[PDB]
Amino acid sequence: KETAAAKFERQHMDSSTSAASSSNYCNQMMKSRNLTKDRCKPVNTFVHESLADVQAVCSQKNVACKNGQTNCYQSYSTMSITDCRETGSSKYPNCAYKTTQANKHIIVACEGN
Amino acid sequence: PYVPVHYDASV
């Protein structure tokens, strides 16, 4: 029934690449992680850092989450990420995505495992 | 002990 911790890894963890390969990276990865199976998830981020380093963020800078909760943490350091955003013309089931490689601080909500 | 469960955003 997949834990929320596990769902985070499936959706955002890409530790076997240091950056977005090509233009087709989002295209591939949204499919691969099963994120295009019923609907086209419109926006998603993949972090290219080890799991340990992302897990460590939970012990970094505490900040409010967008929803007003206070269980959000900002990485002290910038991490390698790829933003995936469904294109304007995309439609289920041929999901299309623009891929943007960037270096930025990530902000994640944390909970106990 | 404490793990990420939602991605809030970048920078």
Solved with? X-ray
What is the second-level CATH architecture of the domain A1-113? Roll (3.10)
| Exposure letters A30-61 (e unless 16+ CB within 10 A, then b) | beebebbeeebbeebbbbbbeeeebbbbbebe
Using CB atoms, pick whichever of B2, B3, B10 lies closest to residue A106. Answer: B10
In three-state secondary structure terms, A91 is: strand
- Phi, psi of B4, deg, nearest 5: -70, 140
Contacts of B2 in chain A (CB under 8 A): 55, 58-59, 110-113
Are the Cβ atoms of A66 and B8 closer than 8 angstroms? yes
3-state secondary structure of A102: strand
Q: Where are the domains of chain A?
A: 1-113
In a 3-state reduction of DSSP, which class is residue A111? strand
From the list A85, A79, A112, the residue with the least C-alpha distance to A99 is: A85
Report d(CA A71, CA B4) in Å as an integer: 10
β A61-63/A43-47 pair status? unpaired
Q: What resolution (Å)?
A: 2.0
The span from the CA of A63 to the CA of A20, in Å, is: 28
Q: What are the φ and ψ backbone dihedral angles of A47, each rounded to 5 degrees?
A: -105, 135
Distances (CA, A) of A60 to A50, A56, A100, A109, A113: 16, 7, 25, 12, 17
Task: List the structure tokens of B11.
Answer: 């920078």
Distance between CA atoms of A25 and A36, rounded to whole angstroms? Answer: 14
Q: Report, as residue numbers or ranges, the catalytic residues of B.
A: 6
